[PDB]
Amino acid sequence: DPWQECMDYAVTLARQAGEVVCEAIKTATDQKVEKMLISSIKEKYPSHSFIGILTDNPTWIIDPIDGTTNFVHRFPFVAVSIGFAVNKKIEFGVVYSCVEGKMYTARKGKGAFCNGQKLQVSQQEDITKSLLVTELGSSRTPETVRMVLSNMEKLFCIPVHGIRSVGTAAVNMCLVATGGADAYYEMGIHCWDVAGAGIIVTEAGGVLMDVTGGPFDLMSRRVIAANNRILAERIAKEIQVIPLQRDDE
Amino acid sequence: DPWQECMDYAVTLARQAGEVVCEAIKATDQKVEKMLISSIKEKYPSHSFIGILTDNPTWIIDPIDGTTNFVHRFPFVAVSIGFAVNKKIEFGVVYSCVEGKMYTARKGKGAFCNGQKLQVSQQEDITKSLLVTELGSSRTPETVRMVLSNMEKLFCIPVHGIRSVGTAAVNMCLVATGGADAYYEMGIHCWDVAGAGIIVTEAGGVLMDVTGGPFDLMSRRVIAANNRILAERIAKEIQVIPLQRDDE
């Protein structure tokens, strides 16, 4: 199988990059690591594409430091994220939370793992009994911020059990995969923030969905990553779509 | 030091409690609560417990800080122990059992996580600061609106960001490490903050009321920051939420 060789190599790279990012903690680092990752992959697979518009070509979708604010603050959640898409479909994902030393991996059809341990999403379907994760965002536009908090307020209007935030899209999503959280939602993310972790959620038995309710669009700047379709749709139903410039357009 | 025997004993008790709490994650609140109280009473029969504060040696305990997290296996669940003599916190112990991080601090002797010394951050500019907070378990219309309002006001200053791991004690301990610059919340209780408060100040941080005045342990309010300048900027922007006190 060809793509299994790519994954083994990607896990090697993600750990190599993670150690570099965590050494730095112990920005210039982000450029330094992305160049290293792209150069490494190009030296082994020179016919592949990269993002940091998606064609059917084997493509590497890289976020060398997911959680840049965390990185600056030494807040213990900083991730290296690598997603691999063939025929516009994610085939495997790698998310290495380096401070945690947690290597999240998932291959299409083979399930999702954290450091060799099988991951399964939670069973919860009642949004009233649900724990969510999200990020407030990097935009400070009063109109956007109001929308973000209103959605958060609306979800607190419903008696949800709670809302958490570790400052990382990929790790927030990985926490859904472990079952620790029931669902994740955010508007303002980019494809490189979620391409690695999306497949880890779905291979944990989760679902990816657009906040409109429709199918998850990798370039929409929007994502719901839930444990099941029931909880995802309820979230989509309750929050309001925020207009934002698409990744391809 | 007579209270050093108390602290050594308290750390062992916390880890034991944490072992039981995490084991069930892989009723519990009652078991651990009874475990701790019956253990300290058998060693120190005349000490007080809270979970009103006299000069008497008093243990302020939270057997499971992060109840929601516990139910959801969200990997932040703490055992918090504060110990007060003469109405002032002498030592504090916070054990985050999922991540196996034992936070400890004795007044005057510094703050530690797994025997590794802690130091708060240097940041004084609030627009370059990372805050931690908690939206609380309260679903009161007047409260929830004011909570998100206060958060909006701080987020629009703007701050570098806001985080939430779902535990007052662990949020505060993250301030002690330097990973976060400040913690704030209204709606907490003395037992949520008694253990972590001294860990912040021994890491070099400050405790403060949202009014800008001295920290009041029974007031339901708290700002645990790296320094006075950052704490006061937070107090300045925050609207005080009315709540019944712990000693009322």
Measured distance CA(A21)–CA(A16) in Å, rounded:
9
Q: At what angle do helices B28-43 and B3-25 cross, to 10 degrees?
A: 160
Q: Which of A84, A119, A154 is the last residue of a domain?
A: A119
Q: Which residues of A touch B (CB under 8 A)?
A: 69-70, 72-76, 122, 131, 136, 140, 142, 145-146, 149, 152-153, 156-157, 159, 161-167, 175, 178-182
Q: What's phi and psi for B25, nearest 5 deg?
A: -75, -35
Same domain, yes or no: B172 and B190? yes
Same domain, yes or no: A70 and A97? yes
Do B135 and A149 count as a contact with CB atoms less than 8 A apart?
A: no
Which residues of chain A have a CB within 8 Å of the CB of B121?
A: 73
B181 has binding-site annotation: no
β-strands B161-163, B182-186: how paired? unpaired
Q: Are A105 and A113 in contact (CB under 8 A)?
A: yes
Cβ burial of A172 (10 Å; 0-12, 13-18, 19+) is buried
Same domain, yes or no: A113 and A17? yes
Q: Which residues of B touch A (CB under 8 A)?
A: 68-69, 71-75, 121, 130, 135, 137, 139, 144-145, 148, 151-152, 155-156, 158, 160-166, 174, 177-181
Q: SS3 for A59?
A: strand
Same domain, yes or no: B212 and B228? yes
Do A73 and B165 count as a contact with CB atoms less than 8 A apart?
A: no
For chain B, give the number of residues: 248
Same domain, yes or no: B4 and B111? yes
* Nearest residue of A to residue B72, measured between CA atoms: A180
Same domain, yes or no: B142 and B229? yes
Q: Which of A104, A119, A134 is the last residue of a domain?
A: A119
* Nearest residue of B to residue A70, measured between CA atoms: B179
For chain A, give the number of residues: 249
Same domain, yes or no: B52 and B157? no
Measured distance CA(B207)–CA(B222) in Å, rounded:
7
Same domain, yes or no: B173 and B225? yes
Resolution (A): 2.6
> Cα–Cα distances in Å, from B24 out to A114, A120, B81, B248?
21, 18, 20, 35
Q: Identify the helix (H) or strand (E) that includes residue A106.
A: strand A102-107
* Minimum-distance CB partner of A75 among B72, B144, B180: B180
Same domain, yes or no: A93 and A159? no
Same domain, yes or no: B128 and B229? yes
Q: How many CB atoms lie within 10 A of CB A15?
A: 16
β-strands B161-163, B116-117: how paired? unpaired
Q: Are A223 and A216 in contact (CB under 8 A)?
A: yes
* Nearest residue of B to residue A67, measured between CA atoms: B161
Q: Which DSSP string corresponds to B21-70?
A: HHHHH--HHHHHHHHHHHHHHHH-TT-EEE----SS-EEEEEEEE-HHHH
Q: Which of A98, A119, A140 is the last residue of a domain?
A: A119
- List A165's β-bridge partners, or say none: B164
Q: How far away is chain B from the Cα of A181, in angstroms, using its nearest Cα?
A: 6
Do B72 and A161 count as a contact with CB atoms less than 8 A apart?
A: yes
Q: Which residue has the tokens 């007047």?
A: B142
Chain A / chain B CB contacts < 8 angstroms: 86
Nearest to B154 by CA among B86, B238, B95: B238
Number of domains in chain A: 2
Strands (E), chain B: 48-50, 58-65, 78-85, 88-96, 101-106, 110-113, 116-117, 130-132, 161-163, 182-186, 206-208, 221-225
Range of the domain at B110: 1-118
Rounded to a whole number, what is the largest CA-CA distance in chain B?
52
* Minimum-distance CB partner of A180 among B72, B148, B152: B72
Same domain, yes or no: B139 and B98? no
Which residues of chain B have a CB within 8 Å of the CB of A162?
A: 68, 135, 137, 166
CB neighbours of A188 closer than 8 A, spacing ≥ 6?
A135, A137, A138, A139, A144, A148, A221, A242, A244
Same domain, yes or no: A146 and A234? yes
Which residues of chain B have a CB within 8 Å of the CB of A178?
A: 73, 75
Q: Identify the helix (H) or strand (E) that includes residue A51.
A: strand A49-51
Q: How many CA atoms lie within 13 A of B138 on its CB side?
A: 22
Q: Which DSSP string corresponds to A187-208?
A: ES--HHHHHHHHHHHHTTT-EE
Q: SS3 for A114?
A: strand
